[PDB]
Symmetry: D3
Subunit: 316 residues, 6 copies
């Protein structure tokens, strides 16, 4: 084939070998890849239960359990395109602004090379430096799976950058197109009598958990696809969209959430869209249980990888 390949499991047992994403070779140069698997070990944007800085290491670890071919779509992503583990974006645990700069820097090297990034957080603030690099020319659409909109304004006085502000920033900076943004799974007590105010004024489509239950998977999918249409789309997967039973290891859980099953069905349903990048954020190992949330992370990573592979091929 000649593409980078995972360590062969008929030969090296899955517990063995240096833990890389999907057991792929490590790369330093983004031009060597069509899809780059990237860690963003960064949780400076976390105002309560931190720990998502350990997400990437543990996702790497549990991705050992992933196999080469998707059993539904039959996509063999490593055969389709050049995929590899591109390491961790530079992070500064003590300096939020420095991290923001340096992560953007890293991502514009990735974008300049033409690689589609598949990223593991890190809390949800990580998605902003990524959009800063990927949405310069044209604004992005987005399918966003989350318990929270992450479109708040300020925290603890007037700090504009937290894991709860990234999509407001991205919209203000013109990186995210709100008319092509759909959010799925929003739930839990809120600060305000009309929380979806910013959302409604700029026209974000918010499918709350309760609307997702009313609609069902198919109708929700039809509505997500309708919102993003034909244009360049990013997929942001916050593991907190899932119920705590499936994703305990997360900073801001809200009970009464999506099932793993349902998340796989929704992601699988995005086949054919022009996906320009994706992430899996908020995996927090210090609140995780037997690496349950790290495994969810790894699997959802692979689900997204398969579709990114197809978009990277189409884009070539």
């Amino acid at each position: 084939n000649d593409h980078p390949q995972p360590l062969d499991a008929a030969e090296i047992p899955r517990f063995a070998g240096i833990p890389t994403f999907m057991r792929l070779p490590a790369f330093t140069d983004p031009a060597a890849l069509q899809v780059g698997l990237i860690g963003v070990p960064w949780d400076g944007g976390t105002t309560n239960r931190a720990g998502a800085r350990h997400g990437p290491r543990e996702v790497r670890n549990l991705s050992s359990l992933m196999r080469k071919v998707h059993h539904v779509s039959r996509i063999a992503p490593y055969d389709l395109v050049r995929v590899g583990d591109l390491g961790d974006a530079p992070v500064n645990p003590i300096d939020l602004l420095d991290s923001l700069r340096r992560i953007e820097g890293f991502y514009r090297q990735v974008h300049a090379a033409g690689t589609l990034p598949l990223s593991v957080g890190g809390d949800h603030l990580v998605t902003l430096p990524i959009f800063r690099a990927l949405g310069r020319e044209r604004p992005l659409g987005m399918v966003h799976f989350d318990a929270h909109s992450d479109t708040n304004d300020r925290y603890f006085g007037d700090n504009p950058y937290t894991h709860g502000t990234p999509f407001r920033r991205a919209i203000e900076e013109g990186l995210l197109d709100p008319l092509r943004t759909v959010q799925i799974g929003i739930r839990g007590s809120v600060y305000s009598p009309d929380d979806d105010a910013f959302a409604r004024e700029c026209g974000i489509r918010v499918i709350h958990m309760e609307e997702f239950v009313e609609l069902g998977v198919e109708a929700t999918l039809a509505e997500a696809r309708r919102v993003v249409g034909a244009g360049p789309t990013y997929v942001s997967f916050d593991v907190d969209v899932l119920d705590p039973a499936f994703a305990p290891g997360t900073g801001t859980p809200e009970i009464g959430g999506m099932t793993s099953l349902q998340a796989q069905q929704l992601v699988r349903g995005l086949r054919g869209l022009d996906l320009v990048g994706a992430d899996v954020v908020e995996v927090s190992p210090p609140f995780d249980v037997g690496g349950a949330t790290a495994l969810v992370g790894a699997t959802m990573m692979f689900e997204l990888l398969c579709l990114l592979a197809e978009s990277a091929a189409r884009s070539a």
Copy 2:
């Protein structure tokens, strides 16, 4: 506008502050409040896996994650009515009858002041002294979420007070109207071929787990609303109604239970009933996993708080 409010999360982070229910101020006088949040740290009635005496503390802890406004109903409970943390009902861990007296004494003051109690257990026996305080004037109706009927007679072999007997006592003492009692979620193997002896003979509506699946949420909700009518009604939520996946921290789990999502749907559907009190019972921290069951309790508590707040508002 002058009601007790949670600590301001724009000022004081959720990991900070001495931990009270919902970050509310502590109160000793129930006349200061319309809805009172009360712990009953008591498990003297547990015949197997104990630890529910630690429930109220961990629920307080995890309730730090609750916010001011319900996202569906828009109810802002601390603006509608005055809510506060009344601390723990006094408990004697070595003397069961002394606990029964003292817990009731506490609830007697709460009832005299006209305050609706919202309680956290404690095993299910804690509901009895509450009913003894709350049901003397007219027998209460009840919506009861549980895996068990808790209507047994005697254990080992002349003891009338366990977590399995509170509602038999309540019916015998004329405090609980069985003809206005609905039990939802009952499941798990039983001791003898006829479990439902007492339950059927006094006319309790028992919606077993199986019937609840046949029925679905909306029809169950309508049957529960039919049974309790326009009369004064108590809501008892036993976390063991949930599947262990959502609530592992409980003494007597039975697999194949309710989802947190389903529980929220069913409790929200109780809107508008004449609710005179409610509790969340059987959270047992020594069997809990990373505060999961404590978070469930805290959230279900917030769900009940909203409905209780509306009742207390209608009374004023």
Copy 3:
């Protein structure tokens, strides 16, 4: 009416007593029982995450929670037939072939006595020696719940015996009738774009997780029954069929799985079939969380026991 009985829970509490299956007496002679509860503490067939050798002990422990009478069917299994704990099948943790030899040996003694076996694993390889003893005369039909087909050929060279090959082996050896085999819950990424090859060629009905969801419980059930028919049938239950939310303590978890509730419904729907034995495999205590998987295992064990008790009852 002189049948072996569980310890009397109205006199001896569930935390007390030597842990045997279902708190029953221990037996060493299979002819003394119609249904024998057997542990197969064996995981030499495991290629990655091991630990199922500890399964039977923890299932013994957690089976303390089971009661005497099924609450839906009203089957009192210990009244219907003679049930007991037959101990553990002989295992050599260090010699795979010797274990196969000895496990088969033990199971032919069980078979020669007309005792129906209900077995707790152990990884899925355990089912092969059992099959070699139960299917010498006439091949078995099977209802198989798993995340994996376990019909692979070879591993790490020319090794034909792992937890992923037992049903391929059983079919080749004429012990399992593929035309009377249905498999339910298969999911997760695979090694090749053509995985169901062996299954499609010999005619195994494979119901993947995706098809189970499209089908629903009742239609899945009718299909399962259509496949096995009136003939002699084994039920093999691998806990990894369950979403890791319900069964974390297993070696090869795959997300987006079956709920505990669904498994109960599906197993309960096998009533009336000519069931000649069953097993519950792949419970791995070292990856379990507070015995949840061991509890699930004990419960499924009770569910199967009821059905088997009905089968043993019919014969005389």
Copy 4:
């Protein structure tokens, strides 16, 4: 020598077999044994963190790791005398007074048969009913390893029976001889500014943690042997004597404790005394980490078994 033996580890691996104490056969008749291994699954005496009721079960489990011969003394207890698992003493989890009565009942049957008990608690109150059976003829001496004196008077009013009063009761009842009591390891903040008042009035030798440190093992032992002399002596080992690092699974930890090493040395040095019984109490699985404390419990149990075996052989 025709004496009961553990399952053969050279043949049956340690993860296998029904979990009895030391993998010994189970007995019903005390007269069949010279040393009886007994569980007392009782924690009605616990006023704060409970769970010791599950102690005997988890100790049975982890005793699977024990071997047949002591590596220092070379005592082979099963060769010397007849040892077996006598099951659990009857317990009433709801009724304290009924428990005391039924446990005594069980122990006087054990005593009437000339059988030396080796008991696993259960909280410390469990030793009282044992002393009530064993202390009738001559009052007993004791070497007692604990963080607390367990010689308090009343709790929560006029309650004379908790895990903190057994030894005061036993002295008042003339079952324990204070002049022949030595207590080793006492430490931790106290309620009373003069806590040791009772112990000093009746002449109990109290070697506090601080004094044990100054004395060292050899000299502490000389002093413990002096106190108990040649008379009949019980050993009561409370795991909370150990530092929480070695025994986390206990209800009332006090840091800065004894090491497992030190405890082994101290018990080993009691060889040659007339030991008429022993217990290991306060193992609390709900607060345990990976069965650490259960293992400690099982090992100390074996340490004592060897000594009790020598005393039993001496008498016969």
Copy 5:
């Protein structure tokens, strides 16, 4: 005493009541107290494994186990002086400088009122704003128990503030007298071929783990007392001085440490010094096991409280 007192355990069980340090009443005004118990829930200075922001809440929880009187020195701190829970110092989880400013501001009020602070972190950076409030008039002496000197210069560029720089800052700012600073337990691999460069150059007495082992407790103590003399001294206790076995719940563990016992002996031996404040830092619940480190923290707090109370009593 008329002094504030812990909840009466003879009446109120230790698992009940809204949890405060040592079960004392909650205070808002530092002039009401002679020793103030304060939480600094702050870990913005943490460069790797964080979580210490949850320290104060869990130390509060586990301090429920503390009793009224020290069992060795016989000091009863609450009878000696007025002690209370002052709550948490204000903390900004996003703005490091804003926290430094606000924490100091809180301690300024505390110091102005003549109140002696006993603090629970939070990571070690938290000691800097404390020193900033306490060491302006005259520089402080210090006994510092730690695995690390915390006298490094810069991190990740020129960030002057981390858990590893605070004492470097305090010396530079004239708040700490290096000549009256002694550090005990220092150990672990270092970044650079010469580490104690700064510490030796300004003349801090550094007693590495190895020297403490050679010296022994008494001789270590005599050296520490020689260093601090008769002048005003602060005691800063980093739980990571302890072996991971005694304190697993900490961010930067180094194996082969001090035991709880040794730590208690070293603190007890500080009796009679002019102690003006103390802290217990680096308790990190997300890495803790069953609250082990919280309990150590709570107990070391009590050890420190007893001596602080005597100092405050001398002054009065």
Copy 6:
């Protein structure tokens, strides 16, 4: 200063980067290195509690906390010699003899290149193939830290290869000189009166735990050095030598063991000896607690590395 270096911690934080031993670069060619860090993830030799196959991945993860310079000895191993991560020796989870051949194959290539191996298991059986490669020309001496002598003969019939036989095999194969072999820490009950036969009859120096305590660290060190002399010597460090308090994550724990501190003092005292290689074995993640034992493994690995670096430097 052209040697391989760990990721720069002033630039790249410890939670970031692909997890290699000590965050060194990954090598594939042994000839590139003077000291080779190797994982041997193999537990086929385990007769009871397995999981050591996961040892090397977790030790890699936690080795992230190691720094560049030994604080006592001042050895900067990466400046001294060329050190790197050689990956994992090949392993067949299902085939013991093939693992034996293939692991030896790998170490043969390592030995041919002049590279000193520093290895992480895997269970203690992993040392045999290592010795088979390193001990042909002349037999090795050994310092061996363990709770067990690992010189048993056969298990479960005649299987000559388990984690309890490696040194029996190595001695019989002329690879280990028993007259230059010292074992330290041996303890715990034994299977029969005469297991120890082999070790004494061939003259291994066996320093039991009891004797180690009698001798003390310094005299144990003197005796270990006397046994090995100036000849080529291997160090085999089994984490089960440590008390379970310090090393919970291990398959066959024996309470009453060495402390982390003692182990460090002992290994550090091996400076100057002709060390030809070392290993750290029996780290078993499925039994570890928050990675405690992996961290111990990582530190002991660093301690050993520093000494190995000196040996490599002298040869060159």
